[PDB]
Every structure is written in structure tokens, then in C-alpha cells.
Amino acid sequence: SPYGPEARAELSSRLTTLRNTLAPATNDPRYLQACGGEKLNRFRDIQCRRQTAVRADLNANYIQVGNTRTIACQYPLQSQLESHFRMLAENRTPVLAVLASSSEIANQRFGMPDYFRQSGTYGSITVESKMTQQVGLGDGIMADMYTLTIREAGQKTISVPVVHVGNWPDFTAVSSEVTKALASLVDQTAETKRNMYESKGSSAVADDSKLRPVIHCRAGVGRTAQLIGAMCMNDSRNSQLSVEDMVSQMRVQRNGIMVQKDEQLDVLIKLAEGQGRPLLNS
Amino acid sequence: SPYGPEARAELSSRLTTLRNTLAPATNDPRYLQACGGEKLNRFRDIQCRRQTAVRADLNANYIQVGNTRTIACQYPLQSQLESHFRMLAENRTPVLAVLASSSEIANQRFGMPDYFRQSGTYGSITVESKMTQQVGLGDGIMADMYTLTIREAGQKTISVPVVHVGNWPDFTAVSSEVTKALASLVDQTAETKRNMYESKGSSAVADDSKLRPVIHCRAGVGRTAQLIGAMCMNDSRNSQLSVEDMVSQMRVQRNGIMVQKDEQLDVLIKLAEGQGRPLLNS
Numbered sequence: 315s316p317y318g319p320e321a322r323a324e325l326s327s328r329l330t331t332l333r334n335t336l337a338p339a340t341n342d343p344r345y346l347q348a349c350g351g352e353k354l355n356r357f358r359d360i361q362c363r364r365q366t367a368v369r370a371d372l373n374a375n376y377i378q379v380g381n382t383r384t385i386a387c388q389y390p391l392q393s394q395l396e397s398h399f400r401m402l403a404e405n406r407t408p409v410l411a412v413l414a415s416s417s418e419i420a421n422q423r424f425g426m427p428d429y430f431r432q433s434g435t436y437g438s439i440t441v442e443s444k445m446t447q448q449v450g451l452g453d454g455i456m457a458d459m460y461t462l463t464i465r466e467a468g469q470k471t472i473s474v475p476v477v478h479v480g481n482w483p484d485f486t487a488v489s490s491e492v493t494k495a496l497a498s499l500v501d502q503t504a505e506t507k508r509n510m511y512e513s514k515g516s517s518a519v520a521d522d523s524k525l526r527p528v529i530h531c532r533a534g535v536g537r538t539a540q541l542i543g544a545m546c547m548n549d550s551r552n553s554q555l556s557v558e559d560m561v562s563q564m565r566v567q568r569n570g571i572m573v574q575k576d577e578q579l580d581v582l583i584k585l586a587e588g589q590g591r592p593l594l595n596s
Numbered sequence: 597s598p599y600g601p602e603a604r605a606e607l608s609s610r611l612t613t614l615r616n617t618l619a620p621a622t623n624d625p626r627y628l629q630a631c632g633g634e635k636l637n638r639f640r641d642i643q644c645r646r647q648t649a650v651r652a653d654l655n656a657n658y659i660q661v662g663n664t665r666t667i668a669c670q671y672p673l674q675s676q677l678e679s680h681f682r683m684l685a686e687n688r689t690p691v692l693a694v695l696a697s698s699s700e701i702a703n704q705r706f707g708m709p710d711y712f713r714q715s716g717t718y719g720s721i722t723v724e725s726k727m728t729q730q731v732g733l734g735d736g737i738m739a740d741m742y743t744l745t746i747r748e749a750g751q752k753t754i755s756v757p758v759v760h761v762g763n764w765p766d767f768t769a770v771s772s773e774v775t776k777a778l779a780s781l782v783d784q785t786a787e788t789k790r791n792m793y794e795s796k797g798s799s800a801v802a803d804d805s806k807l808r809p810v811i812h813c814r815a816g817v818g819r820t821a822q823l824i825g826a827m828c829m830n831d832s833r834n835s836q837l838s839v840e841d842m843v844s845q846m847r848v849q850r851n852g853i854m855v856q857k858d859e860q861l862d863v864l865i866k867l868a869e870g871q872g873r874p875l876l877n878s
């Protein structure tokens with residue numbers, strides 16, 4: 315069977331080799347180094363591939379999986395909020411998906427600023443947050459939506475749709491079903507916003523680096539990778555892209571931890587199976 | 597005014613761009629293609645989004661607008677009736693809303709079989725039609741109700757409540773007041789039937805692809821989309837979902853013609869205004 319134990323063990327074997335190869339050495343030239351000064355990485359061992367880095371002072375990467383273009387990042391550190399908002403505004407972000415829970419954000423020990431549910435001033439940037447719809451995803455998991463309006467003197471004002479999975483559970487994986495519902499919602503939100511930009515003749519439409527959904531959880535490697543994998547499977551342009559391809563691509567373009575847990579890879583396996591998409595490359 | 601000429605012009609503009617982007621190319625990969633064979637699309641330019649298609653041999657789509665889950669389809673071709681009945685039964689359809697007029701049905705040149713007002717045999721499926729209540733909706737518009745009992749050897753017998761509005765003319769919008777009364781009746785009918793299935797511990801309750809109201813008119817883009825929009829505004833879970841959201845969601849999940857006529861979009865605007873719901877996204 316293409317989705318049996320033997321196939322799963324082979325997929326695991328190829329991915330483990332790749333994680334090992336991509337493990338960051340001290341002062342690794344493959345990875346962004348703090349430039350710095352200020353702490354760049356939220357976690358010491360969770361680093362940001364230099365050649366696909368979005369900004370020199372964020373832990374954030376452009377990732378293309380097949381045809382699917384995204385940005386994946388860590389939850390921005392306190393010091394990084396201005397730069398983070400500048401990334402969001404410059405990208406003409408069509409959806410920001412935050413997969414860290416309300417309980418994580420509320421936990422002062424974790425240093426995850428509640429930057430999208432309240433208004434605020436961050437250096438030369440001001441941000442206004444407004445609550446919009448709430449969408450159930452299944453299993454009682456809820457997406458709370460917002461718009462963030464980012465203002466800065468001498469810059470165009472940009473509003474960004476936010477999808478926040480406020481009760482992502484901390485003790486269990488989220489199911490493939492909830493994952494698929496979340497990828498659909500995030501993709502739909504992006505498509506509505508991207509359409510507005512296309513309608514106005516935005517020059518961002520022509521720029522490979524712009525109009526990318528931005529996805530973060532806490533480290534930007536576990537929950538983030540599970541959603542990015544599900545989004546690439548939702549994309550009609552990605553026929554025949556294997557699970558091995560998707561995960562290898564996320565790993566090379568961000569770090570070797572992308573899809574951090576077995577349960578996360580299992581979701582991607584189950585979604586692929588549902589589509590009759592291959593796990594392994596021939 | 598957020599409901600004035602300027603707002604409405606901007607809404608139309610965004611919706612037009614989307615329709616144009618969604619236009620099906622010859623052999624478009626975003627859309628379901630005829631599997632042979634028999635005609636799939638009742639109208640060659642009214643196509644069925646592949647990623648949300650219900651069955652490979654029907655022009656029919658799962659649509660979720662905010663939290664509201666439905667199925668929208670074209671009036672089934674004769675050769676599609678058997679598959680159409682199998683969709684209805686497998687979905688444990690809580691209500692089937694038919695918005696095609698008695699005149700259209702009667703017009704033999706339109707090829708719209710009278711599949712719900714009479715009993716019949718469709719391959720291995722037998723269907724028994726029984727008339728139930730009649731509910732007036734305003735402006736002399738009438739909802740005629742039925743119960744379709746679908747039987748097939750070795751399969752569970754399923755009964756489907758039908759709401760047929762036989763006097764909503766093709767290419768028109770009934771008033772916002774009639775639309776609101778029809779959405780209430782359709783939602784109420786589904787609620788009663790869904791309750792029955794829950795009382796019996798039906799497995800369909802847990803399944804997101806099942807228990808969806810099914811709505812069709814002739815093409816499944818005009819009158820259908822007006823009703824679906826009204827149903828989503830009747831759903832208490834959809835606070836702050838904009839008209840721009842609702843229509844963009846219907847378009848991405850079926851085709852770019854959803855909400856075919858200005859007058860239909862006008863009913864949705866008028867219903868939104870009545871609720872202080874936004875027309876546009878920020």
C-alpha cells in the first residue's frame with residue numbers, strides 16, 4: 315500500500331536525514347544570525363534560512379510549496395513588532411493566520427505580545443484592530459477573525475485580515491478535518507483580499523515576494539507547517555506534488571524542524587491519502 | 597453612507613474583477629469536466645468548481661458562507677437524476693429548495709424533469725412524492741412542500757423535505773421581504789429534519805459534508821445565490837460577515853456567476869442594510 319507502514323517508515327527515514335543535514339551549526343552560514351544585539355530567534359534551535367529570509371531582523375521565511383507561495387515565521391518577539399508590521403504592510407498581506415492560542419498569548423512567561431487583538435503604537439507604526447466574524451472549524455475549535463489597519467507616515471495605509479485559532483489545544487493534535495476546514499477558511503480569506511488588490515490594479519500583483527499569506531504559531535515549525543501543507547493540498551495547481559516534496563520544500567526554505575511532530579506529519583499523510591496524492595517520490 | 601452609491605459601486609467593481617478571474621478557460625482545471633460522455637453542464641458557461649464538487653457527474657458544489665453550509669446545484673439533467681437522488685440520500689438532505697418555476701418545468705424545451713412532484717423510477721432508485729403543506733411568502737409568492745422518499749435495494753430509505761417556490765420567475769429577484777420569509781421557511785424545515793436525525797443518533801451529524809440544505813433553480817447561480825445569501829444572514833453565527841465576503845465565497849466555491857443579476861445583489865444589500873451588516877471589507 316502507498317499509505318501503509320512501509321511507505322510511512324520510508325517517508326520518515328528520508329525526512330529524518332534531511333532534518334539532520336539542515337541542523338544548524340554554530341554561526342551557521344545557512345541561517346540568519348542576529349545582527350544583533352537583540353535576540354532574533356524565539357528558540358535557540360529554531361532558525362531562519364538566510365536565502366529565503368523576509369527581513370534581516372525577523373525569523374520569517376518565504377516558502378513556496380509547489381506553486382503555493384506563503385510566508386512562515388515565529389511569533390514576533392516584543393522588540394520585533396514594528397518590523398513585523400512593516401513586513402505585513404509591505405507584503406499587502408491577504409491573510410495573517412495566527413495559530414498560537416489565546417492561553418499561550420495570555421501567558422506572560424511566553425513573551426507573545428497580543429499584537430492583533432488590540433490597537434497600539436510601535437515606533438513609527440500605529441495599528442488599529444477590529445473584530446470581524448467568527449467561524450467554527452469543527453471539534454469546537456474556533457477561528458476568530460480581525461482586521462488590522464497599519465498606518466505609518468509616508469506609507470500607504472494597509473488593512474490585513476487575521477484568522478486566529480484562539481483555542482488551538484495545547485494537549486492534542488488538531489484533526490485532518492479541522493485542518494482542512496482551516497486551510498479552506500485561510501485560502502478563502504486571502505482570495506477575497508487578493509481580489510480587492512487586483513481590482514484596484516495594485517503593483518503587488520506582479521511581485522513574487524508579495525501578496526503571500528503569513529502564517530505563524532509559536533515557533534512557526536509545527537502548527538504552521540501542518541497548515542501550510544494543508545493549504546498546498548487545497549491549491550488546484552499542485553497535482554502530483556508528494557508529501558515528501560512538500561515537507562522537503564518547507565524544510566529547505568525555513569529549517570529542518572518544519573512539521574515538528576509525528577502527529578503533524580500524520581495529518582499531512584491522511585490529507586494526501588484522501589486525495590490519492592503520493593507520499594513518496596519515485 | 598456605507599450603503600450609498602459609492603459603496604455599491606466599489607462592491608460591484610470588486611465582484612466584477614472576481615467574476616472575470618473565475619471565468620472558465622476552455623478545459624479549465626479549476627472546473628469539473630464532462631467525464632465522457634453525457635452532457636455535464638446544463639449551460640456551457642456555468643461550470644462547477646472542481647475542488648468543491650459533490651459528485652463527478654453532477655454540476656453541484658458544497659458552499660460554506662461564513663458558518664452556513666449548503667449545496668448549490670443546477671437543475672439536474674434527465675441523465676443526472678439517478679446520481680442527483682443518490683446525492684440527496686447520502687447527504688441525508690434536511691431540505692431541498694427548488695426555486696425553478698412551474699412554467700420552466702413545464703417547458704419541455706428546457707429539459708427540466710418533474711422529479712419531485714411525482715413518483716418514479718431512476719435506474720435502481722425509486723422515489724415516492726407526497727404533497728405536504730403550502731406556505732405563503734408574500735406578494736402572492738407560494739412555497740409548495742413535499743416529501744421525497746428515496747429507496748434503493750440494500751440502502752437505507754431516506755425521506756427529503758422539499759420546498760418548491762413555483763412562481764419565482766427566471767432571471768428575477770423576488771423582494772427582500774419574500775426572500776427573508778423563504779430563508780426562514782427553508783432554515784426551519786432543515787432544522788426540524790436535522791433534529792430528527794440527531795434524535796436517532798445519525799452518524800451524518802458529525803460529518804461536515806452531510807446534512808446540508810440543497811438549493812437549486814435552473815442554472816443554480818441567480819435565484820439560488822439570492823436565497824443562499826439570505827440564509828447566511830439568517831444564521832446567528834455570521835455576525836460581521838460582509839456582502840463582499842458572502843458573494844466572494846459563493847463565487848470561489850461554485851463559479852463567478854453566483855448572484856447573476858444586479859437586482860439579486862440588490863436584495864442582499866437591502867437585507868444587509870436592515871441588519872447593519874457591512875457591504876465591504878476594510
Ligand SMILES: O=[N+]([O-])c1ccc(O)c(OS(=O)(=O)O)c1
Nearest residue numbers: 357531532533534535536537538
Ligand atoms: O520547538 N519549539 O520551539 C516549539 C515550542 C513551542 C511550540 O508550541 C512549538 O510548536 S509550534 O509553535 O507549533 O511550532 C514549537
Ligand SMILES: O=[N+]([O-])c1ccc(O)c(OS(=O)(=O)O)c1
Nearest residue numbers: 766767813814815816817818819
Ligand atoms: O447565468 N445563466 O446563464 C443563467 C442561465 C439560466 C438561468 O435560468 C439563470 O438564472 S437562474 O436559474 O436563477 O440561475 C441563469
